[PDB]
Design a protein around this nucleic acid. Structure first.
Ligand SMILES: [Mg+2]
Ligand SMILES: [Mg+2]
Ligand SMILES: [Mg+2]
Ligand SMILES: [Mg+2]
Ligand SMILES: [Mg+2]
Ligand SMILES: [Mg+2]
Ligand SMILES: [Mg+2]
Ligand SMILES: [Mg+2]
Ligand SMILES: [Mg+2]
Ligand SMILES: [Mg+2]
Ligand SMILES: [Mg+2]
Lengths: 70, 145
RNA sequence: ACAGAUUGAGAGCUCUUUCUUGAUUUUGUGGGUGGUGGUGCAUGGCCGUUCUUAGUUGGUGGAGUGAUUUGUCUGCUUAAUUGCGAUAACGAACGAGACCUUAACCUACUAAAUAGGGUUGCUGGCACUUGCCGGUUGACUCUUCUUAGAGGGACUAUCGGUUUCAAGCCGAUGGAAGUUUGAGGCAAUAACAGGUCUGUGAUGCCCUUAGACGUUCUGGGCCGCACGCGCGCUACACUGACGGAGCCAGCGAGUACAACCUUGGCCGAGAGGUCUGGGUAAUCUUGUGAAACUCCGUCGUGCUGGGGAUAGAGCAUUGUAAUUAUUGCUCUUCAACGAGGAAUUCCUAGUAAGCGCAAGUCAUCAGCUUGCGUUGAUUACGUCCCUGCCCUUUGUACACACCGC
RNA sequence: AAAAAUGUGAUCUUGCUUGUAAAUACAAUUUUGAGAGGUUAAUAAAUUACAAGUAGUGCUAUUUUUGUAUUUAGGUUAGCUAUUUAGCUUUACGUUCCAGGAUGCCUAGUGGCAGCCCCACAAUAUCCAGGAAGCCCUCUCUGCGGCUUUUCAGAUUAGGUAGUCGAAAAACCUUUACCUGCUAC
């Protein structure tokens, strides 16, 4: 294993800081900027799409392209 | 669904049934990793327990683990059809049963011994260190145990 | 020829037996008969290969005493000895082409409740205005799709260049079609000591020829494994895997003296059981709602949920018989393999590759095969570098022809 | 590392010329299936450690405070090639495997959304270029393919010659080469 699968509060905070920035957020992009692995990344992305912040471009399974507001 | 908030870090690698349950990953996967549990069976066990298959589950609870262990131990007591098993129909006139760890290995060994004793064609083949289920070794598998 | 010993063995196979059977036979000697016995280098037929390449022939006439040769060729064309041309050659035949079958077009004909639609009846649901989707072989009518009969239609057509302004080729236009329109079927002369005497009551000769190398039963074996190569399949995952959901083909095939395909209903996690049908078949299986695909979710680049081998057990089915797993299903085991070196195969368009179906064999077994459709690219549209083959000119102590002498 | 202060004949720390104390472990897949005989020949590496002869510099430097640390971190060859600011391998040296110790520029980088957040590009040499398995080989623990043979034959094929293969006792660790086969109304 290459790590980047372990989950923390601190990690979450860093992820949050922040949804803003980055032209596009793609599970792939998230990993590996060395963030939480695949599923985790996806979850994070989903969360980010709750109330604004990052709006979508594509919606497909695994090809999930999102971009910053607004 | 949800990212694991809170401090976390609840034990990397758990020890269960004299074998290594791997941390994070998923309960089913852990079960599979144990010498004797497979995929479908693992899934079934998980279902019985009532835990999400989405969760990584190295942060599992103790009670849940215990329940799982119990399930592994006992086919007939819980709702498992009893033809879904590793072993079934064995000894003189009696019951179907299976193990899932070290226990499973032991059972297998016992079975092998029995076969050897019998000196059946299969048993003979086993003794030889050869091809029990009549597959043609004219060309294929040129190395062997 | 019952009875048990006998015998693998309710093989009278016999030796224990002492009953049947009536001139079939049977004991010899001529004489056949059978043989998945031999020899394909004794043959037939069929097939493969030279070669599906472009080659082959003879009638005159000319050149040679002659074997022979020319025609049958410098060139340029063509897939083609295809043509145009040049010409002791002229006109011909075979082979190629034409031909045939199929694959494409037909709102133009002939046709249909065993093919499909339109109006309308009854009838289900909707919005609720008249309108939308349906279901019913209730009526009436149609032939576009369907089939499949008869015909047409493409001839490189029109135009442009290019080429001794020839054969042709190259590009635009139209056209269903412009690669010989695509794909095959057939396919010359001469052959090979290529294969098959284990398709053959096709067969020469030899062998064998009643304890057979005939037949026939029974149990195995073709499947064994230190290991080589040859077709193949499955994978090395993220263009994925797994779940759901969407959901579309074409070739076919399929029983009454058997047991075929088998919907529809209930049981079973499955496999598979059962009852019932429909079908001798554009009618029923069957719209074979085949896969690969498409959508939303779960794992995220870890020999991982990639990969599925070997394994153990049980549940099924086929058959007389499943251990040397027949095959299917259920759980469990999780091996090798992170795109493969030297080498070498196949391929030019609905092709390649992927994907499944399909019949063939078949009681039961698909990784095989002949077909089928579905998804559908990359790169040439050239050349003789290699490989093979073909010719020409050359040289030849070869002619059983370089495995030569 | 930061800081307050005691004291040493004011104080402080850049290496030069010497000899001894120690870390390159362990091995196995392989080597001709097991044992013995040689790390044959060759050969010490700068690396750390104490002290000299002081260029240095007076050698030895003590008593007490602040924090989990707050310190400054990361990485270099060797060969082949007219892909020569690039391509391919990438610790070679009997065959198979090996690793960095430090004089140093390193450098707290330049690019792509620098921002910490990942990608790639940039840090001469190296002193040694050294250690482990294998290392020309010879007797053993005494191996299975020879020695002849006699019996035959499988055959080798169109026919044949010469060799070769298969089943029975004694020391030693190829099924191919070559000769010979056919004609007019
Ligand atoms: Mg016969
Ligand atoms: Mg015969
Ligand atoms: Mg022949
Ligand atoms: Mg022959
Ligand atoms: Mg003449
Ligand atoms: Mg001629
Ligand atoms: Mg013209
Ligand atoms: Mg044609
Ligand atoms: Mg039909
Ligand atoms: Mg696995
Ligand atoms: Mg087959």
């Amino acid at each position: 294993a290459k790590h980047a699968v372990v989950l923390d509060q601190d990690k979450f905070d860093r992820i949050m800081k922040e949804a803003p920035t980055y032209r596009y957020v793609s599970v792939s992009v998230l990993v590996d900027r060395f963030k939480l692995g695949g599923s985790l990344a996806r979850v994070a992305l989903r969360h980010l799409e709750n109330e604004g912040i990052i709006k979508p471009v594509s919606k497909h399974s695994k090809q999930a392209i999102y971009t910053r507001a607004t | 669904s949800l990212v694991v908030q809170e401090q976390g870090s609840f034990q990397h690698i758990l020890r269960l049934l004299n074998t290594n349950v791997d941390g994070n990953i998923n309960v089913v996967y852990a079960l599979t990793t144990i010498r004797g549990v497979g995929r479908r069976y693992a899934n079934l066990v998980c279902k019985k327990a009532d835990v999400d298959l989405h969760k990584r589950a190295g942060e599992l609870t103790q009670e849940e683990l215990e329940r799982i262990v119990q399930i592994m131990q006992n086919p007939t007591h819980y709702k498992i059809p009893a033809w879904f098993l590793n072993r079934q129909k064995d000894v003189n006139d009696g019951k179907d049963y299976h193990s899932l760890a070290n226990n499973l290995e032991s059972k297998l060994r016992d079975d092998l011994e029995r076969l050897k004793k019998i000196r059946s064609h299969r048993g003979i083949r086993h003794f030889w260190g050869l091809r029990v289920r009549g597959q043609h070794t004219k060309t294929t598998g040129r190395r062997r145990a």
